Each structure stands twice: as structure tokens, then as C-alpha cells.
């Protein structure tokens, strides 16, 4: 029988599609067999990390759907994810609530 | 209709396994698809560049691991290396 390489690797991301995108993407002349496995695992890890923080931000807002505001709050409330996505604008995401101390009244 | 081929069903499977009761809107799914495409083409470009620097013709998991260590900050690059190494170890055991 045919078994997916995602199920061989234990992943939720498509190892075969990522293999085809690495092959047809002008990256090297050859692509190793563990390269799409490694890259699908890293992409699934990063997606799961930002999705879990966004789901916690949604639950703290008493919502059950993630909207772009929760992704923006999740990313900008985290030093490593903000260093990763620093030159990235998230559409309909807003800003973090931050007023400088000098502008608040006595 | 020409099969526009997103990452949306895999991002939804990942979301259903980290938050089984939380859903996601279409704009947030579009943002997550752009995020996954972006980090794919950042890691793949750094691995391409490493293979070209070392006069190799193959992108392997060692190039993908070095690209992850160069691109991801801090302990992101520590847990992503663990996830990728675990998936490669599982995959070569069939």
C-alpha cells in the first residue's frame, strides 16, 4: 500500500509537496530525502507555536476564533517571534497597547 | 478553477491538535499561509546559499539544520532543530 511521507515522519505538513517545491524552486541541483522531512517539521513547529499563542490570546479575549489581532498580539508579545517577524506587517492586526509614562497625567 | 494549492488544511490540522475547540477566520488563515510560505522560502534560500558556498550540489538536512540555526532566534532554533531531527530519525526508521 501507499503511505504518505508525512505519516512516515509523523507530521501534519506535506513532505511530498515540500519536496516538489524544493525541486522546482531553483535551490540546488539535487535535493536530499531528509530535507523535506526536516523542513516540514520546522514549518509545522513554527506554525504550531504561533497558532497556540494566538489561540491563548483568543481565549483571553473570550473568543473561540483566531482573528488577525490574536496573531499580532501573539507575535509582538514574544521576543523571539518578534525578532523573527520584525519587518513583517500583519494585515488587520493593529498595534500593541503601549503609552509612554511621560504622557500619562500626574 | 486551477487548483490554487494553499497550506490551509495542514494549518487547520495543526490548529485542531493544539486547540481542539478553537477555529480560525479566513483572513487569519491567509496570514498563517503567508507565514508558512515566508519561513519556507527563507530557510530554503539560506540552505541554497550554504550549499553554494561549500560547493555542494545537494540540499540535505544538514543544510536545512544550519539554515534553521542561522535564521531562527534563540530557543526557537533549539526546539525547531529538535523537531526536525526527531522527524528525520522517525522517517529513516520507516
Amino acid at each position: 500500500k501507499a503511505k504518505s511521507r508525512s505519516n512516515r515522519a509523523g507530521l501534519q505538513f506535506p513532505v511530498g509537496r515540500i519536496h516538489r517545491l524544493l525541486r522546482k524552486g531553483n535551490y540546488a541541483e539535487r535535493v536530499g530525502a531528509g530535507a523535506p522531512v526536516y523542513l516540514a517539521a520546522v514549518m509545522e513547529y513554527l506554525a504550531a507555536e504561533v497558532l497556540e499563542l494566538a489561540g491563548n490570546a483568543a481565549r483571553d479575549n473570550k473568543k473561540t476564533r483566531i482573528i488577525p489581532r490574536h496573531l499580532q498580539l501573539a507575535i509582538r508579545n514574544d521576543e523571539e517571534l518578534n525578532k523573527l517577524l520584525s519587518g513583517v506587517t500583519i494585515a488587520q492586526g493593529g498595534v500593541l497597547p503601549n503609552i509612554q509614562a511621560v504622557l500619562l497625567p500626574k | 478553477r486551477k487548483r490554487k494549492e494553499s497550506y490551509a488544511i495542514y494549518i487547520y490540522k495543526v490548529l485542531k491538535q493544539v486547540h481542539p475547540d478553537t477555529g480560525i477566520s479566513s483572513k487569519a488563515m491567509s496570514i498563517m499561509n503567508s507565514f508558512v510560505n515566508d519561513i519556507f522560502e527563507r530557510i530554503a534560500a539560506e540552505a541554497s546559499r550554504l550549499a553554494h558556498y561549500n560547493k555542494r550540489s545537494t540540499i540535505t538536512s544538514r543544510e536545512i539544520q544550519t539554515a534553521v540555526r542561522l535564521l531562527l532566534p534563540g530557543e526557537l532554533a533549539k526546539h525547531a532543530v529538535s523537531e526536525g531531527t526527531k522527524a528525520v530519525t522517525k522517517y529513516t526508521s520507516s
Partner: single-chain antibody
Amino acid sequence: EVQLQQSGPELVEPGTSVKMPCKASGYTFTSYTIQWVKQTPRQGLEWIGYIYPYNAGTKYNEKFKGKATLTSDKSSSTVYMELSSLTSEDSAVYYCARKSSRLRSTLDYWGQGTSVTVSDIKMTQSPSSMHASLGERVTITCKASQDIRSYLSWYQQKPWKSPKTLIYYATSLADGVPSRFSGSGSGQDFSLTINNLESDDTATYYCLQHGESPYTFGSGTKLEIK
């Protein structure tokens, strides 16, 4: 390379307020939360709360809201903890532990603790004590109350010392821990397994869940070598 040094021992008066530092160096200070753990010899370990020096974002245990406030000092790499209105339920050892903002990460590096003297998911470790030989496998379990998913850590604590991380993410070994220790399990049933014991494996072994919002430790398991 990572140090989280702390104060000396203290004996204070009731009704007053004590402030203790967690001067932490050897790493990038704003990228890791600093967790505060309370250890009394009657109730085990209890998690007070954390502060995130990136945005001064705090989160407390609801039984410590008001009892303890946390502040930061990004110039001096120092996190302070104040306890106000000291009752007799405050004579414990207070450690500060570094933890990354990754959900997978655990309280990896601890402070030595301060002796302070005044004048929801439950983790039920099934063996309360063990006795074993010097080549025997021991197995400690950490039965849970609600489904956390793999967000379990395992710490050992030698007598009168700060705890040391063994396992995080229920299977993954911590840094510098030998492969004799191995974790297992998912959901509600977890396991710690030490393979070939030695003399320096005599400690109390705690399990910490950090999947839900108040982090709860286990009751403990004192392993006795000969």
C-alpha cells in the same frame, strides 16, 4: 554559563515586607521569563508567578494575587519580588527560575534560594517513596487530573539544594543530563525512569505541569539508594 544568583538567608518580623533580588546573568535578559517558586517543607513546591522582562508582563497564582508582586530592572538584569503583610504562612524557601517564552520550554535554570523566616490540575505522584539497588531501574509516575498534552517536566532536588531539570516536554532530556534518565507518556499518564542507579541519584523527584495557567508541581518522591 547561566547564573541566577540570589540573596542570603533572612529572618524577619511579621507585618513587614521583604524584597529579594534575582540578579541573573549569562544570557539575554529580556528573552526569558523569570519564574518564582515557593518551597515549604509541608506543601512541597508551589508556583508563585512569573514576569517577562520584554514587556514587564506578569502572571500570578490566584492564591498569591496581592500577596506577591514582581518587578523588573533591565539596567541591572535584576528581577525583584516583594511579599507584603507577612503572615506565618510565609516561612519557605523562594527560588527564582529562568524559563523561556517557548511553551515547550521548562524552568531550566534555578537560583539557590533564599531562606525566609517570619517571627486546577493536581499532579499525583503515585510512589511517595522508593528504595532500590545500584543497578536497578526505578519508575516514577505522575498521574494527572486534566489532559495536559506533553507539557510535563521532571526535576530532581538534592537535600538543601536548588532543583535540577531532568526531562522537559515529557520525553526530552535536559542539558547535560545523562541518558540514564528517560521520560515517557502523554495526556494524563507520565513516567520517569532511571536505568542504572548510583549513589548520587538520591533526591526528591518532582513533576511539574506547565500546560495550564497555574503551574502545579507534584507531591514528590524520595528515592533511597541502599
